[PDB]
Amino acid sequence: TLWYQTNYVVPPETPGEAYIIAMGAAQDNFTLKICKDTDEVTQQAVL
Amino acid sequence: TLWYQTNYVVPPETPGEAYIIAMGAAQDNFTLKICKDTDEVTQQAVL
Amino acid sequence: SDRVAQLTVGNSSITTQEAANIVLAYGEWPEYCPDTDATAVDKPTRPDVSVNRFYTLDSKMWQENSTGWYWKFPDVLNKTGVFGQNAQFHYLYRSGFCLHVQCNASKFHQGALLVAVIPEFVIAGRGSNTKPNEAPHPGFTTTFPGTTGATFHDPYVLDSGVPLSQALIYPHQWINLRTNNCATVIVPYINAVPFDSAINHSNFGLIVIPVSPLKYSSGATTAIPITITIAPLNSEFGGLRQAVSQ
Amino acid sequence: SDRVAQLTVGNSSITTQEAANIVLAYGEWPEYCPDTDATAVDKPTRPDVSVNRFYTLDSKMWQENSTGWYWKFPDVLNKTGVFGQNAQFHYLYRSGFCLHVQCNASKFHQGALLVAVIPEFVIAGRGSNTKPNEAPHPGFTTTFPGTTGATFHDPYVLDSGVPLSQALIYPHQWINLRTNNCATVIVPYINAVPFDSAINHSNFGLIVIPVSPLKYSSGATTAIPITITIAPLNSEFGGLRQAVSQ
Amino acid sequence: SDRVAQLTVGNSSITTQEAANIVLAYGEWPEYCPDTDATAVDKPTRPDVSVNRFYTLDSKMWQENSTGWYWKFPDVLNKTGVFGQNAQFHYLYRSGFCLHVQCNASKFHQGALLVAVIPEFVIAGRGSNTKPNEAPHPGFTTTFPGTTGATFHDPYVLDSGVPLSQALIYPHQWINLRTNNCATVIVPYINAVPFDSAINHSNFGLIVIPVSPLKYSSGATTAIPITITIAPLNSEFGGLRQAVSQ
Amino acid sequence: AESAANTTPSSHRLETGRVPALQAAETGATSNATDENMIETRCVVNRNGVLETTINHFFSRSGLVGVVNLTDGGTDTTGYATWDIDIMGFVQLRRKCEMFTYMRFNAEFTFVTTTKNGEARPYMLQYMYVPPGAPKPTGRDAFQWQTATNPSVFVKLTDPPAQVSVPFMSPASAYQWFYDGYPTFGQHPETSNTTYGLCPNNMMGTFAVRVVSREASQLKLQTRVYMKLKHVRAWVPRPIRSQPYLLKNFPNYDSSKITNSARDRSSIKQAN
C-alpha cells in the first residue's frame, strides 16, 4: 500500500497533478521451479 | 549557423524571451602576416 | 553525498532527497542498560525486530492559521503493534527513539518549522485562579494525546510558561522549505531511573511549531501535511504480568 | 562531475548541463569486424572522419496529445552526407551508433519520455482481416520513415503487438523533465551476419514515447521540440558498385 | 566547495551562496611599494586596520530602462571614514582594492550585468562642436561622481568613444541572474608613478552596465538594487600636511 | 552459481551520507538495493537450485508444430502431402520462441500418424525431406520418391513414432523471427507490402509423405509433427507478445478491440 506521508505541496503557477511510474523486478535469491504452460493464451485461430 | 535543436520550453509566470550573447577569440595556432593600414578610418578632420 | 540518506531499521526504510545531517541528542547513542546501573532481578526481554522499526503516524494539514502540535512518545505508539502489545503486558520499559518529520513543498512556498524534543514536557494549565477547587488542569487527552496528537493554544509560551525563544537549548532541528524537507533527531533514554512504566510516565515529547508562516501565491497547491515516523531503538521490557489498558 | 559531458566525434561536439550517465548497450563497444568472423574477400573502406560525426535530424514539436515517434537508423542518414553517399555505392555495411536526444523545458513543466532502441523493430499491420488479399500491411514510408520519422497509432502496444510496459528489457533511458534534459545510448552492431545492406534492412530503431503527459500552467512556453543526433561509430563498407537510390 | 566564499578584511566579512571564482587583475596581487621603485624620502604610514576594510556604498535600483553606472575608486571613499581622513591630510597615496558587487533576484527574473575596471577611465564630452569656446566638457560631478555615482548617456560607446564590445580586455566579470548573484575583482595598484595624489587623480573606475535587460512576469518583486563594497588593500600614505577638501 | 543467493546478517544505521534506497531510474539502470542495506535481516544459507530456469531446460520441450492431412481418395485424390517446415503455425511454441531475436539450435522432429476415426493398421509410410531447390514430388508414384541423394524414413503405422535429428542448417550464423527489411531491391509499393518482414534465412524446404503401395488405399491419415529444441543459444531478448496472433507469417493485431495486459479492478485504492 502507498500512503501520503505529509502532502503534495506545489508553488503557484504550477500544475498540481503529477504521476508516479511503478516498476518491478526480482532479487538475487529469486528462484523458480516446475515448468508448465501459461494461462495467457487458451484459444487460437487457424493460421 | 545556429539552429534550434529541441525548443525553448519555459514554465508559466516566466518571461518567454531570452537573449544569447556571442563572444569570439582566437586559438594557440592563430598567426598573422604582412602588416598594412586598416580600413576603419579614411577621412579625418583637421584637428 | 550528505543531502541524501537511507535510514533502515528492521523491515522499514526511509529515503530522502533534501536533508541536513542527523542530530544526535546530547552526544549519546541509545544503548542497553548496563548491569551496574540496573536494579531489577528478572531477565529483560529484547525482541530486536518486531519492536524496532519505523512506525508512521497520521498526517496533519498545516494551514495558514496553524499554531503547532505535540506528542508523547512512549504514549503515541503504545496501542499500535508489537511494541504496544509488549508494553501493555510488562511493567518496566527502557528504549531510545529515532525521529523523522516529513514536510515537502514546491520551490514557491515559504515557511519554517521547529521540531525538537523536550524531556519531561509537562503541560501547564491556563487560567488565573489560585483556589485549589477551580485551578484549571489539563485533561488526559491533553497530557497524553495518544496516536493522534494535540494542538497548542499559546505556542509562544510552549503551553508551559516557558518561552519558545529559549527552546533552542533542547535537541532541535529546523525544517526550512527552501533548504530541506525533512528533519531527523536520534534521542537516547533520558530518565533518573533505569527502568520505568511506559504507561504512567512519558519521558519526553516531540513538538512541531511553525514560527515562519506558510505563504504561497494563488494557484499553487494548498494541502501541506506533516508526517512523522518513530523508531524505538534498543527496546527492553521487564516485569511480565497481565495486560493493562491504561 | 557527472551531470556535465562533452561528446566529441570527428568535427562535432555535444555539450550538456543536465545529464545522466551514458548507456552502453549490452556492455559491448562498437568495434571493427575481426578477421575470424568476416566472410568477404574484398578490402573494406574506412573513412574514419567524414562518416563518423554527429548528424542532427529535424525537430518535432511535442504537444499534449502526442503519441510518439520512431526512426530506422541505417535509413535516416541514408541520403544525407558522406555516410549516405558511401552507403549508396557499396553493398555491404557495418557500423555502430551513438545516440543523443535533446528535450529541455523550464522547472515548471512536467512529463517524462522513454527513448530506447529495439533490434529488428518490425512494424505490425493494424486490422482484423485474415484473408491474404485484404490483410493490411504497412507502407514503405511507415516501415522506412526516412530522415523525417513516423508517428505511432497505438503506442501502448508499440505498434507491434508487444506491450510498452515490457519494453524496458531493451537498452533504454528516461528523459524526466525534473531530472535531466538529454539521454545518451551507445549501441554496437547487432546482426546475425557480419555485413549487411544498409538499404534493404534496418538493424534497429529508436523510439521516443511520452508516457507521462506534458503539462504546464497558462503563461509558460508552449513549443517543446524533440531533437535527435546520430553518430555512426566504426563504419565499414564493402562491395563497391554503382550508386543505387533504394 | 567553490560557489561559497567568506571574504574577511579587518573587521568586515562578506558571505555569499552563489558565486564564481574571484578575478585577480593581471595576475598581480596588491603589494607594498618596494624600496627600489620608491622615490620619496619621508617614511610612509600604514594603518593596516582602520583603512583596510569593506566600505559599503549606497544601493541603486535597476529598472528596465537602465543604462548603467560608474564610479571612481580613489574618489568614492575619499570623504567617508579613516581612509578618507588619512587621504585628506597626506599628499602621496598607494593602495590596491578588493571589489564586490551584489545583485540577487529570484529564479524567475532574467538579465545579465557586466562589472569591470577601466584604468584611466577618462570621460568624453558629448557634442559636435570643434571650436575651443563651445566644445563640451564634463563637469566635476561627471568626472568625479563621489560616493553617489554617475549614470551613462551612451553606454554602447562607454561614454568615451570606445565600444563596449571590446571592453572584455579589461579585468571583468559577469553577473548572470541564472548563475550567480555576486562578482568579485581584486585589483592591484596600476600607475606610471610610485605614489600619487588620491584627490586630483583617479587611477581607475568601476562600471556596471546591464547588457541583457531585466525582465520578469507581472506579480514578482520589482525592486532590484545594485550594492557595491570596496576594500582598500595595502594602503600607504605620505607627505603629511594640512587637510584639504578637494 | 549452483544455488540462488545467501543473506548476510544486517543491522541498523544512524548516520548521514549513505542512501542505498534512492536509486535514480533516469539512468536506465536497475536499482541495486539489496536486503542488507535495508531492514535488518538474518543469516540464511540458500540451497534452492537454479538449474531448471536455464535456456537449455526451457526449450527442451516438444510441443506441436504442424498437422499434415492425407486424403488419398479415388477420383480426386492427390496421393502425396507436402508441408513447408515452419514453426509459426501454433501460438504456443511460437510465443515461447519469439521472446528472443536470434536463436541457434538443433531439432529432434518426431512424427505421429493416426487414422481418421482412430485405428492403427499396418500400412507402411514414407517420410521425405525435400531441401530447398530439390523438385517436389507430384503424385503418389512420382519419379522423386526414389530418394537417391535425399534422406527419407520408412516406417509403418503400428511401429513406434519415428524420430530424426536435424542439425542447424541456416545459411546465416543464427535464426531470426524478426527481419526489419526487404528481400529484394527496387521500388516498394505503399498500398500492400506483401514482401515486408519476409524472413529470407529461414526457409528449410518442404516435408513430404505418401503411402507405399500400388493402386490406392481407402484411408484418411493425419500426421502430427513434434519438434524438440536442443543445443540452443539465444540473443537479444524481446518482450513477450500480449496480443492474439492473427496471421501465419506476419505479426499483426486488431487496431480496434485491443486487449489490455492486465485485467480490470473496481478501484485503484483496493488490492482485491
CSV table of C-alpha atoms in Angstrom, one decimal, chain C residues 4-246:
chain,number,residue,atom,x,y,z
C,4,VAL,CA,20.8,12.0,0.7
C,5,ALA,CA,20.2,9.4,3.3
C,6,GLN,CA,18.5,6.0,3.7
C,7,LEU,CA,17.6,5.0,7.3
C,8,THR,CA,16.9,1.3,7.6
C,9,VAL,CA,15.7,-0.2,10.9
C,10,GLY,CA,14.2,-3.7,10.9
C,11,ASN,CA,11.9,-4.1,7.9
C,12,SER,CA,11.4,-0.3,7.2
C,13,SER,CA,13.4,2.2,5.2
C,14,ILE,CA,13.2,6.0,4.8
C,15,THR,CA,14.6,7.5,1.7
C,16,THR,CA,15.1,11.3,1.2
C,17,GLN,CA,16.5,13.8,-1.3
C,18,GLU,CA,16.8,17.1,0.6
C,19,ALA,CA,18.1,16.5,4.1
C,20,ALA,CA,20.5,18.1,6.6
C,21,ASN,CA,22.8,16.0,8.9
C,22,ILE,CA,21.2,13.8,11.6
C,23,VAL,CA,21.0,15.3,15.1
C,24,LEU,CA,22.3,13.1,17.9
C,25,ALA,CA,20.8,14.2,21.2
C,26,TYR,CA,23.4,15.1,23.8
C,27,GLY,CA,26.1,13.1,22.0
C,28,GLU,CA,24.9,9.8,23.5
C,29,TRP,CA,23.7,6.8,21.4
C,30,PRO,CA,20.8,4.6,22.7
C,31,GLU,CA,22.4,1.7,24.4
C,32,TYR,CA,21.2,-1.3,26.5
C,33,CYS,CA,21.1,-0.9,30.3
C,34,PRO,CA,24.4,-1.9,31.9
C,35,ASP,CA,24.5,-4.3,34.8
C,36,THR,CA,26.0,-1.7,37.1
C,37,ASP,CA,23.1,0.8,36.7
C,38,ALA,CA,20.4,-1.9,36.8
C,39,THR,CA,18.2,-2.6,39.8
C,40,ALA,CA,15.8,-5.4,38.8
C,41,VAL,CA,16.5,-9.1,39.1
C,42,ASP,CA,14.2,-10.6,36.4
C,43,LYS,CA,15.7,-11.0,33.0
C,44,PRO,CA,14.5,-8.4,30.5
C,45,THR,CA,13.2,-9.3,27.0
C,46,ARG,CA,14.7,-7.9,23.8
C,47,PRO,CA,12.6,-8.5,20.6
C,48,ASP,CA,15.1,-6.6,18.4
C,49,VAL,CA,13.0,-6.8,15.3
C,50,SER,CA,9.2,-6.5,15.9
C,51,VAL,CA,9.5,-3.5,18.3
C,52,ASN,CA,12.5,-1.9,16.5
C,53,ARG,CA,11.1,-0.3,13.3
C,54,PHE,CA,9.6,2.9,11.8
C,55,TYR,CA,6.0,3.3,12.9
C,56,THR,CA,4.3,6.0,10.8
C,57,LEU,CA,1.6,8.1,12.5
C,58,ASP,CA,-1.1,10.1,10.8
C,59,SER,CA,-0.6,13.3,8.8
C,60,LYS,CA,-1.8,16.8,9.8
C,61,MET,CA,-2.7,19.5,7.4
C,62,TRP,CA,-0.6,22.7,8.0
C,63,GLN,CA,-2.9,25.7,7.3
C,64,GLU,CA,-2.0,29.4,7.5
C,65,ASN,CA,-3.5,29.9,11.0
C,66,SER,CA,-1.8,26.9,12.5
C,67,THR,CA,-0.2,27.1,15.9
C,68,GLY,CA,1.6,23.7,16.3
C,69,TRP,CA,1.3,20.2,17.6
C,70,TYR,CA,3.0,17.9,20.2
C,71,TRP,CA,3.1,14.2,21.1
C,72,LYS,CA,4.2,12.0,23.9
C,73,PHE,CA,6.5,9.3,22.5
C,74,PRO,CA,6.1,6.4,25.0
C,75,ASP,CA,2.4,7.0,24.6
C,76,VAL,CA,1.8,7.5,20.8
C,77,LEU,CA,2.8,4.0,19.7
C,78,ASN,CA,1.5,2.5,22.9
C,79,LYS,CA,-1.5,0.8,21.3
C,80,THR,CA,-0.2,0.1,17.8
C,81,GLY,CA,1.6,-3.1,17.1
C,82,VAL,CA,4.1,-5.4,18.8
C,83,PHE,CA,5.7,-2.5,20.7
C,84,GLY,CA,2.4,-1.5,22.2
C,85,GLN,CA,1.4,-5.1,22.9
C,86,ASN,CA,4.8,-5.8,24.6
C,87,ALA,CA,4.4,-2.5,26.6
C,88,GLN,CA,1.0,-3.4,27.9
C,89,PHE,CA,2.0,-6.7,29.4
C,90,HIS,CA,5.2,-5.5,31.1
C,91,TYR,CA,5.8,-3.1,33.9
C,92,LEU,CA,9.3,-1.9,33.2
C,93,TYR,CA,10.5,-0.2,30.0
C,94,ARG,CA,13.6,1.4,28.5
C,95,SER,CA,14.3,2.4,24.9
C,96,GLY,CA,15.7,5.1,22.7
C,97,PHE,CA,14.0,6.7,19.7
C,98,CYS,CA,14.8,7.7,16.1
C,99,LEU,CA,12.7,10.6,14.8
C,100,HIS,CA,11.8,11.8,11.3
C,101,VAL,CA,9.4,14.5,10.3
C,102,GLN,CA,8.5,14.9,6.6
C,103,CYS,CA,7.2,18.2,5.2
C,104,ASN,CA,7.7,18.8,1.5
C,105,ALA,CA,6.5,21.7,-0.7
C,106,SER,CA,7.3,23.4,-4.0
C,107,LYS,CA,10.1,25.9,-4.6
C,108,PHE,CA,7.5,28.7,-4.4
C,109,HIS,CA,6.2,28.1,-0.9
C,110,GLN,CA,7.8,29.7,2.1
C,111,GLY,CA,7.8,29.0,5.8
C,112,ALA,CA,9.9,27.3,8.5
C,113,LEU,CA,9.1,24.7,11.2
C,114,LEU,CA,10.8,23.9,14.5
C,115,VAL,CA,10.9,20.2,15.6
C,116,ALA,CA,12.5,19.4,18.9
C,117,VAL,CA,12.3,17.1,21.9
C,118,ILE,CA,11.6,18.3,25.4
C,119,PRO,CA,12.4,15.9,28.3
C,120,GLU,CA,9.7,15.9,30.9
C,121,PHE,CA,7.4,18.1,28.9
C,122,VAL,CA,4.7,18.9,31.5
C,123,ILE,CA,1.6,20.7,30.2
C,124,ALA,CA,0.6,23.8,32.0
C,125,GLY,CA,-3.0,24.7,32.9
C,126,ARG,CA,-4.3,28.0,31.5
C,127,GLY,CA,-6.2,30.3,33.9
C,128,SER,CA,-6.0,33.0,36.6
C,129,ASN,CA,-7.4,31.0,39.5
C,130,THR,CA,-5.4,30.3,42.6
C,131,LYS,CA,-8.0,28.5,44.6
C,132,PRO,CA,-7.4,24.7,44.6
C,133,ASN,CA,-11.0,23.9,43.8
C,134,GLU,CA,-11.1,26.0,40.5
C,135,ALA,CA,-7.5,25.9,39.4
C,136,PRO,CA,-7.6,24.6,35.8
C,137,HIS,CA,-5.7,21.4,35.0
C,138,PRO,CA,-5.3,19.7,31.6
C,139,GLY,CA,-7.3,16.6,30.7
C,140,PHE,CA,-5.9,13.1,29.9
C,141,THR,CA,-6.1,13.7,26.2
C,142,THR,CA,-4.3,17.0,26.7
C,143,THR,CA,-1.5,15.5,28.8
C,144,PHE,CA,-1.4,12.1,26.9
C,145,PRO,CA,-2.7,12.9,23.4
C,146,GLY,CA,-2.2,9.4,22.0
C,147,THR,CA,-1.5,8.4,18.4
C,148,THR,CA,-3.5,11.4,17.2
C,149,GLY,CA,-1.8,14.4,18.8
C,150,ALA,CA,-2.8,17.7,20.5
C,151,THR,CA,-2.7,21.3,19.3
C,152,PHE,CA,-1.2,24.4,21.0
C,153,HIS,CA,-3.2,27.2,22.5
C,154,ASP,CA,-0.3,29.6,23.3
C,155,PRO,CA,2.7,28.3,21.4
C,156,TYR,CA,4.6,31.4,22.2
C,157,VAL,CA,5.0,30.2,25.8
C,158,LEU,CA,5.1,26.5,24.7
C,159,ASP,CA,1.8,26.0,26.6
C,160,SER,CA,4.1,25.6,29.7
C,161,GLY,CA,5.0,29.1,30.8
C,162,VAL,CA,8.5,28.7,29.2
C,163,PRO,CA,9.3,30.9,26.2
C,164,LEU,CA,9.7,29.4,22.8
C,165,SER,CA,12.7,31.6,22.0
C,166,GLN,CA,14.9,29.8,24.6
C,167,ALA,CA,13.7,26.3,23.5
C,168,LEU,CA,16.8,26.0,21.2
C,169,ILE,CA,18.7,24.6,24.2
C,170,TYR,CA,16.9,21.3,23.6
C,171,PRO,CA,17.9,18.9,20.8
C,172,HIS,CA,16.2,20.7,17.9
C,173,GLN,CA,16.2,20.9,14.1
C,174,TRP,CA,14.6,23.3,11.6
C,175,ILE,CA,12.5,22.5,8.5
C,176,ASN,CA,13.1,25.4,6.1
C,177,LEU,CA,11.2,24.9,2.9
C,178,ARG,CA,13.9,26.5,0.8
C,179,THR,CA,16.6,24.2,2.2
C,180,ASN,CA,15.3,20.8,3.2
C,181,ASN,CA,12.0,18.9,3.6
C,182,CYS,CA,12.8,16.5,6.5
C,183,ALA,CA,14.4,16.6,9.9
C,184,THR,CA,16.0,13.7,11.9
C,185,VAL,CA,16.7,13.6,15.6
C,186,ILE,CA,18.1,10.5,17.4
C,187,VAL,CA,17.5,10.5,21.1
C,188,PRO,CA,18.7,8.1,23.9
C,189,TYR,CA,16.9,7.1,27.1
C,190,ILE,CA,16.8,10.1,29.4
C,191,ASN,CA,15.5,9.3,32.9
C,192,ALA,CA,16.6,9.5,36.5
C,193,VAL,CA,15.6,5.8,37.0
C,194,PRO,CA,16.9,2.8,35.0
C,195,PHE,CA,13.5,1.3,34.1
C,196,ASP,CA,10.1,3.0,34.2
C,197,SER,CA,6.5,2.3,33.2
C,198,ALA,CA,5.7,3.3,29.6
C,199,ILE,CA,2.0,4.0,30.5
C,200,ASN,CA,2.0,6.3,33.6
C,201,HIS,CA,5.0,8.4,32.6
C,202,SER,CA,6.0,9.9,29.3
C,203,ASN,CA,9.8,10.5,29.1
C,204,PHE,CA,9.8,13.4,26.6
C,205,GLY,CA,7.7,14.9,23.8
C,206,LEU,CA,8.1,16.0,20.2
C,207,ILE,CA,6.9,19.4,19.2
C,208,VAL,CA,6.3,20.9,15.8
C,209,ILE,CA,5.7,24.7,15.8
C,210,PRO,CA,5.6,26.8,12.6
C,211,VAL,CA,7.4,30.1,13.5
C,212,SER,CA,7.5,31.4,10.0
C,213,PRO,CA,4.0,31.2,8.5
C,214,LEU,CA,3.2,29.2,5.4
C,215,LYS,CA,2.7,31.6,2.4
C,216,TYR,CA,2.1,30.9,-1.3
C,217,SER,CA,0.5,32.6,-4.3
C,218,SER,CA,-2.9,31.9,-5.6
C,219,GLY,CA,-2.7,28.9,-8.0
C,220,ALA,CA,-0.3,26.6,-6.2
C,221,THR,CA,-1.1,23.5,-4.1
C,222,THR,CA,-3.0,24.1,-0.8
C,223,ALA,CA,-2.6,20.8,1.1
C,224,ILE,CA,0.6,20.7,3.1
C,225,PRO,CA,0.7,17.8,5.6
C,226,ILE,CA,3.1,17.0,8.4
C,227,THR,CA,4.1,13.3,8.6
C,228,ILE,CA,6.1,11.8,11.5
C,229,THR,CA,7.7,8.4,11.9
C,230,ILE,CA,9.2,6.9,15.1
C,231,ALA,CA,11.7,4.0,15.6
C,232,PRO,CA,12.0,2.6,19.1
C,233,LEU,CA,15.8,1.8,19.2
C,234,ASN,CA,17.1,-0.6,21.8
C,235,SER,CA,13.8,-1.6,23.5
C,236,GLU,CA,13.8,-3.5,26.8
C,237,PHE,CA,10.9,-4.8,28.9
C,238,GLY,CA,10.6,-6.3,32.3
C,239,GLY,CA,8.1,-7.3,35.0
C,240,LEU,CA,5.8,-9.5,33.0
C,241,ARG,CA,2.2,-9.6,34.1
C,242,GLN,CA,-1.4,-9.3,32.8
C,243,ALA,CA,-2.0,-6.8,30.0
C,244,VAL,CA,-3.4,-3.4,31.2
C,245,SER,CA,-5.1,-0.8,29.0
C,246,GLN,CA,-4.2,2.5,30.8
